[PDB]
Amino acid sequence: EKENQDYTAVSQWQLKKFLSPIYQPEFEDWMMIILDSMLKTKQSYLKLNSGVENSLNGFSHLFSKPLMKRVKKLFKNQQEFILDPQYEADYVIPVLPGSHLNVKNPLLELVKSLCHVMLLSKSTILEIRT
Amino acid sequence: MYYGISQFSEAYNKILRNSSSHSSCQLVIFVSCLNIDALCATKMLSLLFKKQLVQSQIVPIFGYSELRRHYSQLDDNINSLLLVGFGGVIDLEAFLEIDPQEYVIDTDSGEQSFRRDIYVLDAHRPWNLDNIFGSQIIQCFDDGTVDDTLGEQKEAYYKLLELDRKQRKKQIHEYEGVLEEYYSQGTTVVNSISAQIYSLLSAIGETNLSNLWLNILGTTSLDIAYAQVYNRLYPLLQDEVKRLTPSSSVKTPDTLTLNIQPDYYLFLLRHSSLYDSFYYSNYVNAKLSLWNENGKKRLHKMFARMGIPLSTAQETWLYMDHSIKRELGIIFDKNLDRYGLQDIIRDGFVRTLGYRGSISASEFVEALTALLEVGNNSAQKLTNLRKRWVSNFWLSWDALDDRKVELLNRGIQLAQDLQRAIFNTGVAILEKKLIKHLRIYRLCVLQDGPDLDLYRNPLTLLRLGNWLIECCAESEDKQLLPMVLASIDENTDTYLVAGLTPRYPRGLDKKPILNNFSMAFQQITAETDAKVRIDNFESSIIEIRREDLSPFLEKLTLSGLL
């Protein structure tokens, strides 16, 4: 019997380990942002409606505007320090026993992973596709 | 400096004193393949060594690593090496790990001799100062720019090497500043290899009509991007043609003649239609802007004004009615001034023999260039592809012979097809506006298009590049800018990047512009970890991966050495 209900957030992505070490904590950061926006959208929809698509439709209007700017800033940082030997140690790909693919752009792989975990929604797949 | 022109003959004598032996082969000529000038130069050298019986091994080389592989496997019996078309920019001791201590024989008295001679026949005017001055083993066939221009650098290098506080810093840093001002300078050509070897043949006395024709081809092949060189070397060729011509006649099957006659600045005039010659010419599309539909309308309108019907103009030149082609000079003089095509009028060299037709020098060198181009896990593909262009080079060498005119006609047809592909991809670039302005250089990246597998060849990409520079040079609204031309290869998955210098319009008549892409390419390769290939003899030709292309261009536009 708690207003916060003693909720906790669990993130157990093994997808994060197939990324460069600079780009690993940003994946968890954006997953936390996605989770918080999804809870806020679900609460707003539930409070509005109660007084095929789920409660989660339209959740990406809350955070697409920071995300486009963040991806563009990360792209500007990407086109400077990938070939520089000082910052290349953060940009390497790790070798894992499950890995079979080869990365070509780490930011492309991060954007694909984020859009694929956002793409698992069966309801708002059109908006996530846009 | 080590060989001025008046002692080229002496250098050849030294070659005889190392190679005129019937028992063994001792002379190996390293030729830069994919170059018309080196091809004609090695043809004249091979004729000269065939007439005097010198054993030879002619080896075509594409890359610098290919040079290092071929020089590493050379036998110690070889004492004469000729480097044709390359070897004038890099340091050959630092590249071929050359140390004079294990190559010296009979040092005793201030005399030094070596067991191997390496001669350089290079047209790239940035000359390495160690190579030209401090090297005994590497012998340069200099045009004469060392006696006029490179004297301050000579004394700076000599007091740098001789003298191994404020006085020492004040003179040594000044001489190093002079040397580093001579270095980091762009690449240019002012003389052809064929002219230097024909000067050697004039010094010896083995000149004839065939060597003169090969010299004419070697000089004419530089008329695309180095027209000042051709305009400088034209009166010497005129004097030689009027010297070695016979007294006079009737057309007979044995009399080869080589006339100085009007040879207009057209693509394949005597082996195609007049409509296709004006339509596929770089200068005509450069001025009248034939890439859009208005240029084609203007070309048809000037065909109406010249009085040539399109049925007659599209007919083959050999089957053309000669009421059009006999007074074509008068028609050109009367009609081309209103459309701005006055510079089509140009006197060139036309050779014919027997009854098999006339060939110009320009048509012959485009046929030879086409026979270089399309004449016939990734590292195996690159090795097979380098072997393919070496086979193309030897096919073009086979086309240089008089008895193999079928190879020449195959080269003519290949030149027509390749110019059709170049025209289609050029209007593909111009219609959708892939040329981007980057305020210091102009960028053109080919991602996809018609028959993109022809652009893994260097000279085909240079043909497209010269097409773009000629088309953009006559447009005065955008000023002179260097061009980056990148073409993608999907199977190799590499962007082959070419650096193209701009040029002034052909009608104007000064100091030639330099090629500042090699300095930036070397500095970005040194500073960054880009996996790139620098091995091409033309240093503006590099290969980048697809994923490393955009950081390379960002570091290129950040660098101010363009």
mmCIF file of N, CA and C in Angstrom, chain B residues 405-448:
data_model
loop_
_atom_site.group_PDB
_atom_site.id
_atom_site.type_symbol
_atom_site.label_atom_id
_atom_site.label_comp_id
_atom_site.label_asym_id
_atom_site.label_seq_id
_atom_site.Cartn_x
_atom_site.Cartn_y
_atom_site.Cartn_z
ATOM 1 N N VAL B 405 47.064 -3.362 -87.080
ATOM 2 C CA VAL B 405 46.056 -2.307 -87.138
ATOM 3 C C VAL B 405 44.675 -2.776 -86.690
ATOM 4 N N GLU B 406 44.441 -4.092 -86.625
ATOM 5 C CA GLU B 406 43.180 -4.597 -86.089
ATOM 6 C C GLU B 406 43.054 -4.291 -84.602
ATOM 7 N N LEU B 407 44.175 -4.333 -83.875
ATOM 8 C CA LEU B 407 44.188 -3.887 -82.483
ATOM 9 C C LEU B 407 43.877 -2.400 -82.382
ATOM 10 N N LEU B 408 44.356 -1.611 -83.348
ATOM 11 C CA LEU B 408 44.060 -0.181 -83.370
ATOM 12 C C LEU B 408 42.577 0.079 -83.622
ATOM 13 N N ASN B 409 41.961 -0.677 -84.536
ATOM 14 C CA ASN B 409 40.529 -0.517 -84.789
ATOM 15 C C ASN B 409 39.688 -0.990 -83.607
ATOM 16 N N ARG B 410 40.136 -2.046 -82.920
ATOM 17 C CA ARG B 410 39.489 -2.466 -81.681
ATOM 18 C C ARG B 410 39.588 -1.380 -80.617
ATOM 19 N N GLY B 411 40.740 -0.708 -80.539
ATOM 20 C CA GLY B 411 40.878 0.426 -79.641
ATOM 21 C C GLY B 411 40.000 1.603 -80.012
ATOM 22 N N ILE B 412 39.774 1.816 -81.312
ATOM 23 C CA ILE B 412 38.872 2.876 -81.765
ATOM 24 C C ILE B 412 37.441 2.589 -81.314
ATOM 25 N N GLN B 413 36.991 1.343 -81.503
ATOM 26 C CA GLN B 413 35.644 0.958 -81.074
ATOM 27 C C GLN B 413 35.497 1.018 -79.554
ATOM 28 N N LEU B 414 36.542 0.606 -78.828
ATOM 29 C CA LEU B 414 36.535 0.702 -77.372
ATOM 30 C C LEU B 414 36.515 2.153 -76.908
ATOM 31 N N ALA B 415 37.213 3.041 -77.624
ATOM 32 C CA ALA B 415 37.187 4.463 -77.296
ATOM 33 C C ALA B 415 35.805 5.057 -77.515
ATOM 34 N N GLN B 416 35.121 4.638 -78.585
ATOM 35 C CA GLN B 416 33.754 5.099 -78.829
ATOM 36 C C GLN B 416 32.805 4.648 -77.722
ATOM 37 N N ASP B 417 32.878 3.364 -77.341
ATOM 38 C CA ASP B 417 31.998 2.846 -76.290
ATOM 39 C C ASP B 417 32.307 3.474 -74.931
ATOM 40 N N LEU B 418 33.591 3.658 -74.625
ATOM 41 C CA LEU B 418 33.986 4.247 -73.351
ATOM 42 C C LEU B 418 33.623 5.723 -73.284
ATOM 43 N N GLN B 419 33.694 6.434 -74.413
ATOM 44 C CA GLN B 419 33.254 7.823 -74.423
ATOM 45 C C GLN B 419 31.743 7.933 -74.302
ATOM 46 N N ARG B 420 30.997 6.962 -74.844
ATOM 47 C CA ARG B 420 29.555 6.922 -74.611
ATOM 48 C C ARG B 420 29.236 6.724 -73.132
ATOM 49 N N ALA B 421 29.964 5.818 -72.469
ATOM 50 C CA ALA B 421 29.759 5.598 -71.037
ATOM 51 C C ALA B 421 30.162 6.818 -70.212
ATOM 52 N N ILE B 422 31.264 7.474 -70.593
ATOM 53 C CA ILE B 422 31.732 8.676 -69.905
ATOM 54 C C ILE B 422 30.730 9.813 -70.070
ATOM 55 N N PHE B 423 30.170 9.965 -71.275
ATOM 56 C CA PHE B 423 29.154 10.986 -71.524
ATOM 57 C C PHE B 423 27.883 10.726 -70.725
ATOM 58 N N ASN B 424 27.447 9.460 -70.664
ATOM 59 C CA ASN B 424 26.248 9.117 -69.905
ATOM 60 C C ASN B 424 26.437 9.364 -68.412
ATOM 61 N N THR B 425 27.597 8.999 -67.864
ATOM 62 C CA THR B 425 27.823 9.235 -66.441
ATOM 63 C C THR B 425 28.081 10.715 -66.152
ATOM 64 N N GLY B 426 28.653 11.449 -67.109
ATOM 65 C CA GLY B 426 28.833 12.881 -66.929
ATOM 66 C C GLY B 426 27.524 13.646 -66.904
ATOM 67 N N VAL B 427 26.603 13.318 -67.816
ATOM 68 C CA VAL B 427 25.292 13.951 -67.749
ATOM 69 C C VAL B 427 24.487 13.417 -66.568
ATOM 70 N N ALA B 428 24.790 12.201 -66.093
ATOM 71 C CA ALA B 428 24.202 11.706 -64.852
ATOM 72 C C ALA B 428 24.629 12.546 -63.656
ATOM 73 N N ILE B 429 25.911 12.912 -63.601
ATOM 74 C CA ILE B 429 26.408 13.789 -62.543
ATOM 75 C C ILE B 429 25.795 15.179 -62.665
ATOM 76 N N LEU B 430 25.727 15.710 -63.887
ATOM 77 C CA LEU B 430 25.308 17.095 -64.072
ATOM 78 C C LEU B 430 23.804 17.297 -63.913
ATOM 79 N N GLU B 431 22.985 16.281 -64.207
ATOM 80 C CA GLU B 431 21.537 16.469 -64.148
ATOM 81 C C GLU B 431 21.025 16.516 -62.713
ATOM 82 N N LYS B 432 21.493 15.608 -61.860
ATOM 83 C CA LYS B 432 20.985 15.503 -60.498
ATOM 84 C C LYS B 432 21.766 16.339 -59.493
ATOM 85 N N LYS B 433 22.839 17.010 -59.933
ATOM 86 C CA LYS B 433 23.649 17.947 -59.142
ATOM 87 C C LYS B 433 24.255 17.275 -57.903
ATOM 88 N N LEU B 434 25.123 16.295 -58.165
ATOM 89 C CA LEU B 434 25.924 15.697 -57.102
ATOM 90 C C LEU B 434 27.200 16.470 -56.805
ATOM 91 N N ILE B 435 27.517 17.496 -57.586
ATOM 92 C CA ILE B 435 28.684 18.324 -57.311
ATOM 93 C C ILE B 435 28.357 19.253 -56.151
ATOM 94 N N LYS B 436 29.114 19.130 -55.066
ATOM 95 C CA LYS B 436 28.878 19.895 -53.851
ATOM 96 C C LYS B 436 30.004 20.897 -53.640
ATOM 97 N N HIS B 437 29.641 22.088 -53.174
ATOM 98 C CA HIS B 437 30.591 23.166 -52.937
ATOM 99 C C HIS B 437 31.016 23.136 -51.475
ATOM 100 N N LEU B 438 32.322 22.992 -51.237
ATOM 101 C CA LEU B 438 32.864 22.920 -49.884
ATOM 102 C C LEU B 438 33.842 24.055 -49.596
ATOM 103 N N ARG B 439 33.798 25.124 -50.407
ATOM 104 C CA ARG B 439 34.403 26.446 -50.196
ATOM 105 C C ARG B 439 35.930 26.442 -50.370
ATOM 106 N N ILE B 440 36.548 25.264 -50.426
ATOM 107 C CA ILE B 440 37.981 25.163 -50.678
ATOM 108 C C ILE B 440 38.193 24.140 -51.792
ATOM 109 N N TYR B 441 37.235 23.229 -51.948
ATOM 110 C CA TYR B 441 37.304 22.198 -52.974
ATOM 111 C C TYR B 441 35.892 21.782 -53.355
ATOM 112 N N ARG B 442 35.775 21.177 -54.533
ATOM 113 C CA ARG B 442 34.503 20.697 -55.057
ATOM 114 C C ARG B 442 34.469 19.179 -54.952
ATOM 115 N N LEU B 443 33.366 18.650 -54.434
ATOM 116 C CA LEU B 443 33.252 17.236 -54.113
ATOM 117 C C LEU B 443 32.220 16.573 -55.014
ATOM 118 N N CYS B 444 32.602 15.445 -55.609
ATOM 119 C CA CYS B 444 31.701 14.652 -56.435
ATOM 120 C C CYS B 444 31.867 13.186 -56.068
ATOM 121 N N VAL B 445 30.823 12.599 -55.486
ATOM 122 C CA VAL B 445 30.840 11.215 -55.029
ATOM 123 C C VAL B 445 29.831 10.425 -55.846
ATOM 124 N N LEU B 446 30.297 9.362 -56.492
ATOM 125 C CA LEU B 446 29.437 8.466 -57.260
ATOM 126 C C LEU B 446 29.042 7.317 -56.344
ATOM 127 N N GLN B 447 27.754 7.233 -56.018
ATOM 128 C CA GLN B 447 27.259 6.129 -55.208
ATOM 129 C C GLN B 447 26.732 4.983 -56.061
ATOM 130 N N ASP B 448 26.065 5.303 -57.170
ATOM 131 C CA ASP B 448 25.550 4.316 -58.110
ATOM 132 C C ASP B 448 25.293 4.982 -59.455
#
